[PDB]
Design a protein around this ligand. Structure first.
Ligand code: HEM
Length: 291
């Protein structure tokens, strides 16, 4: 099935910058969430999980249809906690009812990365809501207790290569694991609502110990109070991933550029953009606008 991007009728860059801005202003205002981490990280994760159900083999799932709004997908155990991002976006959608669900979930992620001082992420509009029966089944998002071979094979289904995977995983600088949500507990670093390459630095430089958490799952822990999932740790066990981790630990701009590309790509898998579609938008941050 082909999903052709269809611009919300009559809308242009300024309309979507207004949505961006409303997201960004609420991100600033609603700062208490998650022990003052704020909603940035969970909005990034929402964008990823709504996009990461995609299957390149048959174009099922993906960001286009905004299917997270249906109960099968919002109740996926893999999505536990993302309801907080959805609830955040609800008043945004009420103010701007013309935006599609897929466009809003993906734009939330872009807006969060940028407002957290991450790279600019070009973003294209035109996702169109699809019906409840187009919601992908549970089980397409990745397990965390696995090794590098798992990770590499997993991401082939999203058409991501080693560099794209390692770049995307850098988003694990953000937020934290929550025991009741995933069976893992703890942040990955200190700067968890500012977008930086800290994930890579911590992987290489902390002294990690393989421990069991209070849900009886193994995770890697440091004396600084940070953690890594087994799938995170796999990025330094595998020599191909390790090289790339070292690259990003040593070049913040390179990480930014590669993350931006990979994240846009993730958010756009499955969508066909007509030849005469608008160019991707690059939204100004609130800071850049003086707001
Ligand atoms: C092998 C792939 C991955 C696995 C197994 C994985 C697993 C996890 C787990 C278990 C959590 C903790 C959920 C919780 O307890 O709240 C988490 C959080 C998160 N992940 Fe992933 N993840 C992967 C890839 C990614 C990618 C590709 C991105 C986005 C580019 C991403 C962004 C996030 C963010 C931002 C959080 C923090 C959420 C919060 O603080 O609420 N993850 N991930």
């Amino acid at each position: 099935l082909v999903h052709v991007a269809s611009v919300e009728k009559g809308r242009s860059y300024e309309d979507f910058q207004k949505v961006y801005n409303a997201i960004a202003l609420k991100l600033r205002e609603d700062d208490e969430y998650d022990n003052y981490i704020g909603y940035g990280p969970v909005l990034v994760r929402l964008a990823w999980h709504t996009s990461g159900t995609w299957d390149k083999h048959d174009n099922t799932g993906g960001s286009y249809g905004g299917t997270y709004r249906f109960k099968k997908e919002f109740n996926d155990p893999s999505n536990a906690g993302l309801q907080n991002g959805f609830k955040f976006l609800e008043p945004i959608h009420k103010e701007f009812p013309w935006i599609s669900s897929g466009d809003l979930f993906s734009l939330g992620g872009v807006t969060a990365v940028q407002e957290m001082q991450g790279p600019k992420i070009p973003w294209r509009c035109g996702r169109v809501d699809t019906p409840e029966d187009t919601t992908p089944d549970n089980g397409r998002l990745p397990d965390a207790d696995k090794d590098a071979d798992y990770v590499r094979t997993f991401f082939q289904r999203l058409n991501m290569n080693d560099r794209e995977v390692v770049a995307l995983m850098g988003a694990h600088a953000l937020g934290k694991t929550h025991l009741k949500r995933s069976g893992y507990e703890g942040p990955w670093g200190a700067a968890n609502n500012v977008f930086t390459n800290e994930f890579y630095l911590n992987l290489l430089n902390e002294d990690w110990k393989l421990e069991k958490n209070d849900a009886n799952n193994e995770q890697w822990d440091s004396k600084s109070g940070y953690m890594m999932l087994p799938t995170d740790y796999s990025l330094i066990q595998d020599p191909k991933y390790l090289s790339i981790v070292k690259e990003y630990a040593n070049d913040q701009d390179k990480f930014f550029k590669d993350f931006s590309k990979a994240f846009e790509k993730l958010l756009e898998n499955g969508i066909t953009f007509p030849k005469d579609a608008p160019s991707p938008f690059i939204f100004k941050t609130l800071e850049e606008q003086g707001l």
